[PDB]
Amino acid sequence: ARGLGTARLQLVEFSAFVEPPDAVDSYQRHLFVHISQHPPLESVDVRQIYDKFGLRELYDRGPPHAFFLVKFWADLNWSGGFYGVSSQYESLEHMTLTCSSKVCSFGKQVVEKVETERAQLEDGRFVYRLLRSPMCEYLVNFLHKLRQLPERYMMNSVLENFTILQVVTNRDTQELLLCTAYVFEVSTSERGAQHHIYRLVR
Ligand SMILES: *CCC(=O)n1cc2cccc(Nc3cccc(C(F)(F)F)c3)c2c1
């Protein structure tokens, strides 16, 4: 694969953002993370991130190529605005998707989010839109609380135990389509949000 996504279901865009209250007057938005997919990928052993998450249960269930690892270098420099998460997938089949998002701190599932979104025909492609979903209030507080840590390495220390498991399944057939594991560091002030996309093997 050359990017995040199987060839049965591919991730177009994924972003967690904030819009300040004066975005109505003049629109700006700040990206905590961002993936835009609109050279093959490097390999990471899934046995090496088992402790951070069920990943082993899902991986043995398969298929292996559906599993990806993304690390974010989040932008945490930017209160009371809207906090949003947007996801967008594309496929050549017409499916109904179930997208579970399990957020674990220290391996303990803190928040889980399950969503359903059915296909839409758009220019020879089937587009799945989960745009502008409000962020969990826990995650807004955690992002807030992480923001005034006095040191960058303390932020990285806390984020060492903070993981997100993305599970996208065909709702009708119950089969797994895409699985992404998110591991977090914090980017510097001068750099924006960044990602690297690995592929989980073995
Ligand atoms: C709790 C449900 C929710 O609103 N939600 C669904 C998600 C799916 C995937 C990822 C995230 N959150 C996320 C993504 C990137 C970076 C962050 C961080 F807070 F900046 F660390 C959070 C959510 C949130």
UniProtKB/Swiss-Prot annotation:
Localization annotation: Nucleus
Span list, region Transcriptional activation: 1-202
Assembly information from the UniProt record: Interacts with YAP1 and WWTR1/TAZ.
Function noted in UniProt: Transcription factor which plays a key role in the Hippo signaling pathway, a pathway involved in organ size control and tumor suppression by restricting proliferation and promoting apoptosis. The core of this pathway is composed of a kinase cascade wherein MST1/MST2, in complex with its regulatory protein SAV1, phosphorylates and activates LATS1/2 in complex with its regulatory protein MOB1, which in turn phosphorylates and inactivates YAP1 oncoprotein and WWTR1/TAZ.
Protein name listed in UniProt: Transcriptional enhancer factor TEF-4
Organism: Homo sapiens
